[PDB]
Enzyme design. Structure first.
Site, short mmCIF file in Angstrom:
data_model
loop_
_atom_site.label_atom_id
_atom_site.label_comp_id
_atom_site.label_asym_id
_atom_site.label_seq_id
_atom_site.Cartn_x
_atom_site.Cartn_y
_atom_site.Cartn_z
N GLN A 19 -5.80 -3.64 10.60
CA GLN A 19 -7.20 -4.11 10.86
C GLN A 19 -7.00 -5.34 11.75
O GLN A 19 -5.93 -6.00 11.72
CB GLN A 19 -7.85 -4.54 9.59
CG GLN A 19 -8.37 -3.45 8.76
CD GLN A 19 -8.95 -3.92 7.42
OE1 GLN A 19 -8.51 -4.93 6.78
NE2 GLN A 19 -9.97 -3.15 6.95
N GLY B 1 0.87 -7.21 7.09
CA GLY B 1 -0.08 -6.70 6.05
C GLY B 1 -0.93 -7.75 5.32
O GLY B 1 -1.14 -7.66 4.09
N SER C 233 -4.73 -9.89 6.29
CA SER C 233 -5.91 -10.15 7.15
C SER C 233 -6.12 -11.62 7.43
O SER C 233 -7.01 -11.96 8.27
CB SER C 233 -7.18 -9.44 6.55
OG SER C 233 -7.58 -10.12 5.38
N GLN D 114 1.36 -13.84 -0.32
CA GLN D 114 0.14 -13.86 -1.08
C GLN D 114 0.11 -12.87 -2.18
O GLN D 114 -0.82 -12.89 -2.97
CB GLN D 114 -1.03 -13.67 -0.08
CG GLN D 114 -1.17 -14.82 0.87
CD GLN D 114 -2.13 -14.52 1.97
OE1 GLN D 114 -3.35 -14.51 1.69
NE2 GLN D 114 -1.61 -14.10 3.16
N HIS E 58 0.02 -17.14 -4.64
CA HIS E 58 -1.13 -16.75 -5.50
C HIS E 58 -0.65 -16.41 -6.90
O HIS E 58 -1.47 -16.08 -7.75
CB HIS E 58 -1.89 -15.63 -4.84
CG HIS E 58 -2.51 -16.06 -3.54
ND1 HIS E 58 -3.06 -15.17 -2.64
CD2 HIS E 58 -2.60 -17.28 -2.97
CE1 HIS E 58 -3.47 -15.82 -1.58
NE2 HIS E 58 -3.22 -17.11 -1.75
N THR F 174 0.76 -1.19 0.00
CA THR F 174 0.00 0.00 0.00
C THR F 174 0.81 1.27 0.00
O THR F 174 0.42 2.27 -0.62
CB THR F 174 -1.10 -0.05 1.15
OG1 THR F 174 -0.48 -0.18 2.43
CG2 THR F 174 -2.09 -1.16 0.95
N1 AR6 Z 1 0.77 0.17 5.54
C1 AR6 Z 1 0.17 -0.87 6.20
N2 AR6 Z 1 0.60 -1.33 7.41
C2 AR6 Z 1 -0.03 -2.28 8.14
N3 AR6 Z 1 -1.11 -2.96 7.72
C3 AR6 Z 1 -1.61 -2.52 6.49
C4 AR6 Z 1 -1.07 -1.46 5.72
N4 AR6 Z 1 -1.81 -1.35 4.57
C5 AR6 Z 1 -2.79 -2.25 4.69
N5 AR6 Z 1 -2.70 -2.94 5.83
C6 AR6 Z 1 -3.49 -4.09 6.28
O1 AR6 Z 1 -3.21 -5.09 5.36
C7 AR6 Z 1 -4.19 -6.08 5.28
C8 AR6 Z 1 -4.33 -6.71 3.93
O2 AR6 Z 1 -5.42 -7.65 3.94
P1 AR6 Z 1 -6.14 -8.05 2.55
O3 AR6 Z 1 -6.37 -6.74 1.90
O4 AR6 Z 1 -7.10 -9.18 2.91
O5 AR6 Z 1 -4.95 -8.80 1.67
P2 AR6 Z 1 -4.42 -10.28 1.88
O6 AR6 Z 1 -3.04 -10.25 1.22
O7 AR6 Z 1 -4.50 -10.93 3.26
O8 AR6 Z 1 -5.37 -10.99 0.84
C9 AR6 Z 1 -5.25 -12.40 0.63
C10 AR6 Z 1 -5.61 -12.69 -0.85
O9 AR6 Z 1 -7.00 -12.34 -0.96
C11 AR6 Z 1 -7.29 -11.59 -2.16
O10 AR6 Z 1 -8.50 -12.13 -2.74
C12 AR6 Z 1 -6.00 -11.85 -3.03
O11 AR6 Z 1 -6.04 -13.15 -3.59
C13 AR6 Z 1 -4.87 -11.89 -1.95
O12 AR6 Z 1 -3.62 -12.57 -2.32
C14 AR6 Z 1 -5.51 -5.32 5.78
O13 AR6 Z 1 -6.09 -6.16 6.76
C15 AR6 Z 1 -5.06 -3.96 6.12
O14 AR6 Z 1 -5.56 -3.34 7.30
#
Ligand code: AR6
Ligand code: 7M2
Ligand code: ZN
EC number: 2.3.1.-
Length: 282
Positions: free
Chosen positions: A226, A198, A200, A104, A124, A48
């Protein structure tokens, strides 16, 4: 596919206040010092800060879709630079403080940062990587491969073959790549410390790997703005920006974050570099 379960989107962000954030990043340093085998698990949240939106954040891809709005990119995938986090991971592997990296992300940035591919599982896929259906040989390209869902890209294999080249971007029904998942699972099982950054942790089996570390008494740390799916199993949860957490951590470790040379591909990990001696942990 149009009704694929996108999980919980847009949950409120949490921010550890500064003194608590300090204390926790000190404790994370403590754990890194004490562990034999550290595995890092990364998701969309570590990119991000380079202009790539996440999936389930307040402005994430799926979150915005749910609201009828569009995600926003502040970069292309080609012009995106590795974050401070990404480069921190490079250094930790070079000094032998990271055993293995499970991601991922399809953004290509771990590879482009120069992180060694033989210590990386790209669960992925990678949008820069295509793969020969016949001999399995991978090409890391300098521009994104135009297709997703393991489709023919239109190019052929040039191994000393002419097989169809296909993308490595998994669709919803596609199972994970066997090599990457088996390595990631081995690494996570053998780890005494898994650190999630980073993510969820909602996708399985990807999001479940860090719990494999809890097996033989391993520790689990979660760094995320989150809530995550496995918050209750963490030894430590740090609610803050991953770049602020990682920069502080490197400072405690006495490690510099290295310069990015621009896009580079490193297949095999180099010999480990000297690292600071370890504090006494009473
Ligand atoms: N600068 C930051 N610092 C800390 N946390 C952060 C920041 N930016 C965002 N976040 C947190 O970063 C987290 C990102 O969670 P998600 O967005 O579910 O991504 P995933 O990689 O687990 O998604 C898994 C797969 O699902 C998809 O369908 C694709 O297939 C993916 O490969 C959030 O909870 C944010 O609060
Ligand atoms: C990683 C983080 N944010 C968005 C993406 C998506 N970007 C994108 C943008 C345009 C078309 C297709 C895609 N895509 C395919 C897999 C994931 C993505 C990936
Ligand atoms: Zn081939």
């Amino acid at each position: 596919p149009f009704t694929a379960d996108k999980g919980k989107c847009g949950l409120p962000e949490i921010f550890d206040p500064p003194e608590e954030l300090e204390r926790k990043v000190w404790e994370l340093a403590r754990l890194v010092w004490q562990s034999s085998s550290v595995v890092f698990h990364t998701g969309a949240g570590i990119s991000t800060a380079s202009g790539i939106p996440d999936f389930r954040g307040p402005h994430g891809v799926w979150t915005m879709e749910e609201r009828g709005l569009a995600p926003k990119f502040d970069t292309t995938f080609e012009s995106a630079r590795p974050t401070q986090t990404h480069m921190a991971l490079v250094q930790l592997e070079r000094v032998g403080l990271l055993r293995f990296l499970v991601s991922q992300n399809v953004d290509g940035l771990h590879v482009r940062s120069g992180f060694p591919r033989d210590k990386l599982a790209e669960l992925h896929g990678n949008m820069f990587v295509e793969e020969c259906a016949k001999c399995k040989t991978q090409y890391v390209r300098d521009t994104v491969v135009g297709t997703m869902g393991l489709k023919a890209t239109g190019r052929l294999c040039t191994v000393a073959c002419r097989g169809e080249l296909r993308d490595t971007i998994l669709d919803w029904e596609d199972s994970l790549p066997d090599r990457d998942l088996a390595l990631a699972d081995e690494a996570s099982r053998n780890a005494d410390l898994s650190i999630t950054l980073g993510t969820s942790l909602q996708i399985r089996p990807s999001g479940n790997l860090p719990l494999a570390t809890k097996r033989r008494g391993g520790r689990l740390v979660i760094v995320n703005l989150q809530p995550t799916k496995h918050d209750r199993h963490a030894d430590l949860r740090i609610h803050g920006y991953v770049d602020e957490v990682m920069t502080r951590l490197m400072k405690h470790l006495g490690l510099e974050i290295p310069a990015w040379d621009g896009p580079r591909v490193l297949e095999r990990a180099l010999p480990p570099l000297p690292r600071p001696p370890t504090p006494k942990l009473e």
